[PDB]
Amino acid sequence: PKDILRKDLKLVHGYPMTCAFASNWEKIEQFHSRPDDIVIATYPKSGTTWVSEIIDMILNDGDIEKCKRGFITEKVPMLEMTLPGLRTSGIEQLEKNPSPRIVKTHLPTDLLPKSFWENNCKMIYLARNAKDVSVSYYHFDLMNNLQPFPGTWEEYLEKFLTGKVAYGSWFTHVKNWWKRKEEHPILFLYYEDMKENPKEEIKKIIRFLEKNLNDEILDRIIHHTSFEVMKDNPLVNYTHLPTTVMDHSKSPFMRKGTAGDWKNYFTVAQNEKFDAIYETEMSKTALQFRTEI
Amino acid sequence: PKDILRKDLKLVHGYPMTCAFASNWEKIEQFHSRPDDIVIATYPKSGTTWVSEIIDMILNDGDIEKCKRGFITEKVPMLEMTLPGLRTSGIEQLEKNPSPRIVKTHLPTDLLPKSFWENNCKMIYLARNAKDVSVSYYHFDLMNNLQPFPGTWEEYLEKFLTGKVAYGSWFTHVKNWWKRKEEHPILFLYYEDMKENPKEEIKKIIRFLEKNLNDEILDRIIHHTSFEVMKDNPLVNYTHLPTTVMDHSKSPFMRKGTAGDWKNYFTVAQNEKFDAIYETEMSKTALQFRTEI
Ligand SMILES: Nc1ncnc2c1ncn2[C@@H]1O[C@H](COP(=O)(O)O)[C@@H](OP(=O)(O)O)[C@H]1O
Numbered sequence: 001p002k003d004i005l006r007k008d009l010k011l012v013h014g015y016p017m018t019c020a021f022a023s024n025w026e027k028i029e030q031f032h033s034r035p036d037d038i039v040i041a042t043y044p045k046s047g048t049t050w051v052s053e054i055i056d057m058i059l060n061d062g063d064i065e066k067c068k069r070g071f072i073t074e075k076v077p078m079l080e081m082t083l084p085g086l087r088t089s090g091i092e093q094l095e096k097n098p099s100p101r102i103v104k105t106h107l108p109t110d111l112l113p114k115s116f117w118e119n120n121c122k123m124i125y126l127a128r129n130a131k132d133v134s135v136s137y138y139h140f141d142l143m144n145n146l147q148p149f150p151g152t153w154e155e156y157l158e159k160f161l162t163g164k165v166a167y168g169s170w171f172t173h174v175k176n177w178w179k180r181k182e183e184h185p186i187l188f189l190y191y192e193d194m195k196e197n198p199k200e201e202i203k204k205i206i207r208f209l210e211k212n213l214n215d216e217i218l219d220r221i222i223h224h225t226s227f228e229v230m231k232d233n234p235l236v237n238y239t240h241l242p243t244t245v246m247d248h249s250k251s252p253f254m255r256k257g258t259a260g261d262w263k264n265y266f267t268v269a270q271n272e273k274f275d276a277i278y279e280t281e282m283s284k285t286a287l288q289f290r291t292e293i
Numbered sequence: 294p295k296d297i298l299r300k301d302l303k304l305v306h307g308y309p310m311t312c313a314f315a316s317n318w319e320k321i322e323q324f325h326s327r328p329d330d331i332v333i334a335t336y337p338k339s340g341t342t343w344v345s346e347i348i349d350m351i352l353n354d355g356d357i358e359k360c361k362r363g364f365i366t367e368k369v370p371m372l373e374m375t376l377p378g379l380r381t382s383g384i385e386q387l388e389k390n391p392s393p394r395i396v397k398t399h400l401p402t403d404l405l406p407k408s409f410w411e412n413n414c415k416m417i418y419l420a421r422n423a424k425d426v427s428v429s430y431y432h433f434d435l436m437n438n439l440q441p442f443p444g445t446w447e448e449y450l451e452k453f454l455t456g457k458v459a460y461g462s463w464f465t466h467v468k469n470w471w472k473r474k475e476e477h478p479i480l481f482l483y484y485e486d487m488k489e490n491p492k493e494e495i496k497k498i499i500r501f502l503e504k505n506l507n508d509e510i511l512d513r514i515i516h517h518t519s520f521e522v523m524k525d526n527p528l529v530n531y532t533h534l535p536t537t538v539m540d541h542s543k544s545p546f547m548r549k550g551t552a553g554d555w556k557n558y559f560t561v562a563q564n565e566k567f568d569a570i571y572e573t574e575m576s577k578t579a580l581q582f583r584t585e586i
């Protein structure tokens with residue numbers, strides 16, 4: 001463990017990558033998908049864990065005890081995750097998992113195993129406004145010891161803006177995933193929409209996944225996957241991980257679960273600078289993020 | 294025409310209704326919706342025409358020339374409108390219109406054709422503060438010859454407060470439509486938010502309508518749907534109606550276009566009596582109206 005903890009990011013295909021995840025990349029590259037695999041793809045801290053539980057519920061017809069068959073890391077493995085000696089890798093877990101497999105990933109489009117495009121796999125891409133992500137990712141690096149130490153918020157926001165963070169730039173991640181939406185079966189969702197109206201957003205996932213679930217099951221999914229519920233659910237709140245991987249005393253994994261929390265952290269000067277870069281990166285795209293609800 | 298001009302309101306389902314519209318309700322009740330119809334529903338005088346032009350622009354990807362294919366009454370017909378001999382009825386017009394159809398209505402939730410709920414049609418409900426609505430509706434009755442003469446402003450405000458106006462009580466209208474948003478895909482909007490921040494409000498409509506528009510197109514919609522531009526737009530300013538329907542010389546349809554205009558008409562005595570009725574009607578509800586920005 002001493003060799004992966006708090007280490008510098010390594011570049012893999014031009015992307016800064018968590019040191020623990022950066023070895024044997026050949027295995028990821030060559031991963032074999034099944035045509036009924038369902039990918040949930042997000043930039044980090046964008047609501048992956050939230051929507052993994054929603055999807056597991058949908059696929060289990062809202063049966064909560066089925067959703068309690070294991071920890072989230074077993075039900076919905078992160079494809080690119082490795083912590084050898086400490087944990088089954090994501091791909092090792094996935095090769096033991098029954099179809100249809102839910103696969104979580106934060107990979108950029110050009111790093112996703114091509115098998116997933118080739119098997120025409122259904123994908124849910126979820127995105128969250130860049131300001132809330134930077135704040136959530138900052139606190140994440142406080143508690144997750146696989147990450148480099150983030151420094152001060154001021155130092156961290158500058159790395160985030162220039163893409164000097166694990167998985168690289170949020171702008172490029174979001175823009176390149178959005179572009180793929182035209183030639184693949186990808187449902188593109190916003191975190192803020194899920195926060196404001198989970199029923200209508202969950203219905204989009206239900207239709208995308210070719211399921212019909214009645215209003216009682218839907219209400220149960222909404223209730224089971226609410227922040228207050230999930231935060232106390234020990235199968236999903238990440239307290240099952242070794243303290244050497246995640247120390248929740250520094251920041252809880254389930255932290256605030258809100259839109260607009262970034263305003264508690266951004267100075268007005270940081271905000272002006274951030275808005276200027278954002279307009280440069282995003283004005284020409286059809287993406288329309290909300291930074292509060 | 295002399296048969297429907299300046300006539301008393303007629304009761305339909307316990308709602309006072311413009312005499313001209315109070316006929317052939319069977320036709321309205323049995324209207325056939327299409328799954329992609331877009332309902333814009335409002336209490337009268339709440340920004341219907343404004344939001345109609347916005348949605349038309351959104352659906353046409355910001356193409357102003359396409360937005361010039363016809364007058365607003367043809368582009369975005371009023372469902373329950375009938376001016377027989379003088380105008381194609383709203384429903385006749387809708388049955389001539391290609392999908393996706395935008396459908397305008399001031400109908401209370403209980404009078405909306407059932408077909409719209411059954412088809413799961415997207416709806417945008419726009420609401421405006423009750424004081425600005427009352428002033429706006431007063432002025433409208435001056436110019437609109439289908440309406441009864443409203444009397445003095447003092448006599449009119451008393452009818453408004455007691456719901457003795459076409460489409461009945463504003464309080465019931467907004468409360469029941471707000472309740473509905475928990476059971477149907479309904480984007481509920483505030484006139485005063487659109488006025489303060491049209492960019493953000495328009496982004497909600499773009500998302501809700503599942504459209505892909507960049508910032509150039511967005512700024513273009515904001516400009517083309519500003520008050521100053523629309524009031525001079527002969528296709529939306531309602532100057533195409535017969536003088537027998539609308540005499541703009543009494544009061545222009547595109548009247549003031551602002552939040553807070555009510556302060557020019559309300560006496561201090563009226564305002565106290567209004568506020569007391571308001572609190573009785575509205576203090577339980579989660580709605581939050583601004584009377585100025
Ligand atoms: N049920 C839920 N509702 C809302 N947000 C949730 C949630 N479950 C997790 N989250 C939030 O999603 C973010 C984590 O994303 P990921 O799973 O992609 O790591 C965290 O945000 P905050 O740090 O802003 O609280 C976390 O609190």
Ligand SMILES: Nc1ncnc2c1ncn2[C@@H]1O[C@H](COP(=O)(O)O)[C@@H](OP(=O)(O)O)[C@H]1O
Pocket residue numbers: 335336337338339340341342343425428429430432518519520521523546547548549550551554
């Ligand atoms: N582009 C625009 N911007 C702001 N307000 C607008 C608008 N177009 C119309 N309105 C206002 O919407 C009201 C009429 O609404 P409806 O279309 O629902 O009858 C009028 O309010 P005022 O009488 O306060 O001017 C009108 O001036």
